[PDB]
Amino acid sequence: KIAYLQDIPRTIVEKDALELILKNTPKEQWENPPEDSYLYTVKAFAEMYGPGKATKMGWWDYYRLKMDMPDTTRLSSERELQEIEEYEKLMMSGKVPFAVPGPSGYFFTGFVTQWKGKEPFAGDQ
Amino acid sequence: FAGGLTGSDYGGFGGKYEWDPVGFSTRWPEHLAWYREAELKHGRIAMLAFAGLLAPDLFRLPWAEFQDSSLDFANAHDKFVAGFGPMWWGFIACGGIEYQRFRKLGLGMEGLTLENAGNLGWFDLPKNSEERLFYETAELKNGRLAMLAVSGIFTAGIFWDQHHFPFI
Amino acid sequence: FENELGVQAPTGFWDPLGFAKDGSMKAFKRRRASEIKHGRIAMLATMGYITPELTGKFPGLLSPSMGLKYEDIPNGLGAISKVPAVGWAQILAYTFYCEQSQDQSEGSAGEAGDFGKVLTSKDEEGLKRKLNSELANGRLAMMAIIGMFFQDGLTGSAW
Amino acid sequence: ARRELAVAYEDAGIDLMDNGKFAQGLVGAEAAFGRYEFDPIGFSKYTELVPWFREAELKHGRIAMLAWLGLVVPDFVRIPGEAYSFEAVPRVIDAHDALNADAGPNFQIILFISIVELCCAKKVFEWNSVETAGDYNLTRLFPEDDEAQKQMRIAELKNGRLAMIAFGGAVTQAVITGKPFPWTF
Amino acid sequence: GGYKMSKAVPFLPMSPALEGYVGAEEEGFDPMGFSLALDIRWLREAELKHGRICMLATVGWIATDLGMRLPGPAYQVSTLEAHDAMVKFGPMAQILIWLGIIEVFSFLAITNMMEGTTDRQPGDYGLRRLYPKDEEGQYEMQLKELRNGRLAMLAFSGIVTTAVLTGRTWPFXXXXX
Amino acid sequence: KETSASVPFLPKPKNLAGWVGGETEFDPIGFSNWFDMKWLREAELKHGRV
Amino acid sequence: AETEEGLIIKPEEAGKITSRDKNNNPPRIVVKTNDWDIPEYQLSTGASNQVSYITPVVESEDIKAWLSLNVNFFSIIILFTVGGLIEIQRFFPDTLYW
Numbered sequence A: 001k002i003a004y005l006q007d008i009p010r011t012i013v014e015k016d017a018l019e020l021i022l023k024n025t026p027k028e029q030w031e032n033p034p035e036d037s038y039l040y041t042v043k044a045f046a047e048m049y050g051p052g053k054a055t056k057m058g059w060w061d062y063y064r065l066k067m068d069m070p071d072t073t074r075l076s077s078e079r080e081l082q083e084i085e086e087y088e089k090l091m092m093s094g095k096v097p098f099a100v101p102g103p104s105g106y107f108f109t110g111f112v113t114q115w116k117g118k119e120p121f122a123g124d125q
Numbered sequence B: 001f002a003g004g005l006t007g008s009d010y011g012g013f014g015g016k017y018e019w020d021p022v023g024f025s026t027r028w029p030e031h032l033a034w035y036r037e038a039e040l041k042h043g044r045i046a047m048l049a050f051a052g053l054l055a056p057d058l059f060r061l062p063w064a065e066f067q068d069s070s071l072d073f074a075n076a077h078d079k080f081v082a083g084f085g086p087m088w089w090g091f092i093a094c095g096g097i098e099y100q101r102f103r104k105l106g107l108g109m110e111g112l113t114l115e116n117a118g119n120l121g122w123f124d125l126p127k128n129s130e131e132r133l134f135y136e137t138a139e140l141k142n143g144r145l146a147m148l149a150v151s152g153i154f155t156a157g158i159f160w161d162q163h164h165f166p167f168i
Numbered sequence C: 001f002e003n004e005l006g007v008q009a010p011t012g013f014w015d016p017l018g019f020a021k022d023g024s025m026k027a028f029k030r031r032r033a034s035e036i037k038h039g040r041i042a043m044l045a046t047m048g049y050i051t052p053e054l055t056g057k058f059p060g061l062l063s064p065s066m067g068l069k070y071e072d073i074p075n076g077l078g079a080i081s082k083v084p085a086v087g088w089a090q091i092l093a094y095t096f097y098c099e100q101s102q103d104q105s106e107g108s109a110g111e112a113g114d115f116g117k118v119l120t121s122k123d124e125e126g127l128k129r130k131l132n133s134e135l136a137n138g139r140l141a142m143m144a145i146i147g148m149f150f151q152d153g154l155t156g157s158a159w
Numbered sequence D: 001a002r003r004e005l006a007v008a009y010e011d012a013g014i015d016l017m018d019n020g021k022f023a024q025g026l027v028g029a030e031a032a033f034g035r036y037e038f039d040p041i042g043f044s045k046y047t048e049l050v051p052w053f054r055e056a057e058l059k060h061g062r063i064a065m066l067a068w069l070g071l072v073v074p075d076f077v078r079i080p081g082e083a084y085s086f087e088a089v090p091r092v093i094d095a096h097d098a099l100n101a102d103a104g105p106n107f108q109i110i111l112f113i114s115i116v117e118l119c120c121a122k123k124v125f126e127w128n129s130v131e132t133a134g135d136y137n138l139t140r141l142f143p144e145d146d147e148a149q150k151q152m153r154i155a156e157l158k159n160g161r162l163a164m165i166a167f168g169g170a171v172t173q174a175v176i177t178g179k180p181f182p183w184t185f
Numbered sequence E: 001g002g003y004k005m006s007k008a009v010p011f012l013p014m015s016p017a018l019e020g021y022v023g024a025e026e027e028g029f030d031p032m033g034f035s036l037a038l039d040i041r042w043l044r045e046a047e048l049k050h051g052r053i054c055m056l057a058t059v060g061w062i063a064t065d066l067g068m069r070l071p072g073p074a075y076q077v078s079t080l081e082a083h084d085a086m087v088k089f090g091p092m093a094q095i096l097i098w099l100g101i102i103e104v105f106s107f108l109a110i111t112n113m114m115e116g117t118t119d120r121q122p123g124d125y126g127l128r129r130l131y132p133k134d135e136e137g138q139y140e141m142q143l144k145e146l147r148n149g150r151l152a153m154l155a156f157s158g159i160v161t162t163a164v165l166t167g168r169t170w171p172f173x174x175x176x177x
Numbered sequence F: 001k002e003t004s005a006s007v008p009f010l011p012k013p014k015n016l017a018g019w020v021g022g023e024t025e026f027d028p029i030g031f032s033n034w035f036d037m038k039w040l041r042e043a044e045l046k047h048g049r050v
Numbered sequence G: 001a002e003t004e005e006g007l008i009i010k011p012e013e014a015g016k017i018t019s020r021d022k023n024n025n026p027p028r029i030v031v032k033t034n035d036w037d038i039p040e041y042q043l044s045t046g047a048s049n050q051v052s053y054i055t056p057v058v059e060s061e062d063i064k065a066w067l068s069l070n071v072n073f074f075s076i077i078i079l080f081t082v083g084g085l086i087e088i089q090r091f092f093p094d095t096l097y098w
């Protein structure tokens, strides 16, 4: 498996939070997290601090690290990820979850109106 | 969910409810024995509390200090405890019973597990094995209801100044 | 510790309860240092108890802004409410500057507080006789001062 | 085994590893009949904060040990003066309200406690490890052997924990009674 | 055997910026670690300037309270009102102009020392009078200057606060509290 | 790094060779390093004479 | 320059180098970030009394260069001109001499 995701100390990031990160992050980005992605910071620190590495940190460095990691609440859960993965699928499939404008906003009516007409490239169909 | 505790199951239109929407069981699984013990002991006391507030209104104990009017549920406490009084007679009694629970489960309540919780061993009415499951849920469902009932009784009765069974 | 002074002659190693019968040089160092310091303080205290009664009451005013002169204040337990607490604070603070400073010591000797009030290093058995005499005087002073204070509590003051 | 802060400080910092003991091998758990590892809410599972929590427990116990002794002694003796006389402040608890703000006494205590805390604050965050937590070098009567050092450490914690609880009753009983040292009705 | 422990605060290691400086490696007092966040040279310059200002100001307050005055009826004011009265009189503005030119020179000294253009010690302005020739003598003389400066800073603080709180000349001995 | 004889806490002003005050080189602000000091000398002499 | 004694080490030897310092500070990990304003972020390995100045690094030369920027030059000159006009108006109001 991936090297830096093994035996990562709980003090760096908790187990459940790390699993939530891995779920939210797309699979192809685990090996080399991009940049400005919580997984990038997890890699850049778990490769410095761990069992076989520097086991201690200055209080301020650890404080700053704890404010760079996710706080276990800013990550989408499985049902939210399903919501997105299915909403985008609907939108790209030419179907729109029907919504109706309201008082500065719109109520979702819970209906799938097929949006693209018989001529999918026609604007008025 | 919560070991094999009977709080869920036989719980209404759905067979099982399993209401733990904070995760106080999954987060602290070592305390499911403690939580049941506390939940049951809360229910039993609340049920005696609600059935309490009503019966003094008709009969009064022969202690001859409790044998006085105007001792409603907003003043009986602060009145009986004296310079000692009846409230200490009750508290000492509750100490005697609670000491028995210590002996059965050890001093640190190490023997307290998810099946012996809230089981003092007083078996007179129950029969069979499935009824014990049915009665255990009937216990809690009554117990949880009275815990909210006496909560409403105490708050509404003393806020709106009712002090009697309607508590309105 | 059967040679570290204090064993003069009337009795030898006086350790009935054996409070120093283990060999803890650190604990004995703390014990001897506190013993010597108490002897010194009791020596000044007992001298401070006898004199203001006998003679020598200081001339001026202790607190001119309150009129209180040294003569007016009582001599003994009871003066702790007549000497102003600000004066007691100054007594504590000065003795602090002489106990935790001017006489703060470590890795030197039992109670060789260095400065002191002149830096002076002696030699020979004469040091032993004088140092043992200081311990003997301090022990007598420590017993005496608690006697004076305890008696005054149950005899008032003076004769 | 009480490494001096001079060297002990070389292993200080936010430890990122787990000792595997109850609370990173810290004193305070050993009870009378055996061990009484207490933490039921699992605060010590956040091992990175165990040195911090021990510092807070010692700091609270030390304040409470003085604070409880605080509510006792004014009831039997007071500072020589009129502002502290038994007639101006009858009970001890009506002192934060009497001697405070423009009065001067409590305000000066706040400042000088602030000065000490702002000076000894770098030891609480930096230089604070699971070994030198609460150790401010003031080791005079500390025993030398390791097991007896544990007893004194255990003695302080149990006394500090007791005073923390005892002070809570002290102010609560006093305020509901307005009575001298034995705050019983 | 480990950290160079500070002599003042025994439970806090001495800051490395306090090495080899006057005062400093005799007490090493810096628990809040200001020397760990600012240049030690600038801190020492500010400390010496404050010490000198306070040593002048304390003696000025003593002299004014004890009754020493300039031979002018415009100066027959208390030390508390001396600042406002002399600001309205004029000499405070002129004193500020003169201290401004002297501080322009001091600012040039700081700029040319921090940039390394010169080899100036933090508080050194070149004045060498009653200064011991021996290096240890110079070090202990600078120690005496620092100690007196700090004492005068605290003393002037107390003098001003007590004088404002109790309208009273410098000794404050009579007072009422 | 030498210092000026006049103000000993400041660096010795370069470009101030011997004209008059070469023994007490005095240029704290540093106009001689900013301007043609021959013009500065001319201005100083004219000011002094006037 | 400012880290003449830090025992600065690379990520590859986070747990390998232990020689502390001329002080007793443990070695610091240097991370080469790509930001130009923060080219290198240094990470600690333990408690340390490291002197990290929070003050900026300015010098007289580039401060004067900034004041030599055309905005500062043409703002100082125009500010002095406007102030001189205002002072002349205060001292010789209503142009009575004309």
Ligand code: CLA
Residues within 6 Å of the ligand: C001, C002, C003, C004, C005, C006, C007, C011, C012, C013, C014, C015, C018, C019, C020, C021, C028, C031, C032, C033, C034, C035, C038, C139, C140, C142, C143
């Ligand atoms: C603070 C006082 C103090 C201290 C720290 C010491 C300490 C010491 N003394 Mg010492 N001593 C003292 C007072 C003190 N003494 C007094 C007042 C006398 C006169 C009787 C003596 C007479 C004496 C002799 C003759 C000898 C010592 C020796 C020693 C050393 C070894 C013995 C030992 O372990 O004692 C440890 C110290 C103690 C255990 C002191 C405990 C005293 C308790 C607190 C109270 C005692 C009763 C008290 C009067 C009760 C007050 C009543 C009130 C509470 C109601 C040790 C360093 C011996 C020595 O030189 O060893 C080489 C030795 O030969 N001492």
Ligand code: KC1
Residues within 6 Å of the ligand: B010, B011, B012, B013, B014, B016, B017, B141
């Ligand atoms: C407005 C406050 C309120 C009350 C007062 C109330 C009361 C009871 N609820 Mg209830 N409830 C909500 C709110 C309230 N419920 C909400 C917002 C939801 C959506 C999440 C919800 C859902 C369920 C489900 C799924 C079940 C359930 C139960 C019971 C029950 C047990 C009766 C019996 O078993 O003795 C009683 C008394 C169980 C069931 O039996 O319902 C009959 C069960 O399965 N509830």
Ligand code: KC1
Residues within 6 Å of the ligand: C062, C063, C064, C065, C066, C083, C084, C086, C087, C088, C090, C091, C092, C094, C095, E173, E174
């Ligand atoms: C040179 C430094 C110095 C000064 C300048 C100074 C000044 C005053 N001292 Mg002090 N003093 C010492 C040093 C100095 N004292 C020292 C080293 C000691 C040895 C412990 C000492 C002892 C006492 C005692 C025992 C008392 C006392 C007091 C006063 C007082 C009165 C105020 C007033 O007149 O109202 C004033 C002005 C008396 C008092 O009444 O204080 C309220 C009093 O009780 N002092």
Ligand SMILES: CC1=C(/C=C/C(C)=C/C=C/C(C)=C/C=C/C=C(C)/C=C/C=C(C)/C=C/C2=C(C)CCCC2(C)C)C(C)(C)CCC1
Residues within 6 Å of the ligand: G082, G085, G089
């Ligand atoms: C502070 C600040 C602010 C404010 C600002 C302002 C508001 C400004 C304004 C300003 C102004 C608004 C100014 C004005 C000025 C004016 C002037 C300066 C005038 C001038 C004039 C002149 C110069 C004239 C001249 C003349 C004459 C007189 C005669 C001849 C002709 C002529 C016309 C030339 C804010 C808050 C925003 C932010 C922060 C900072």
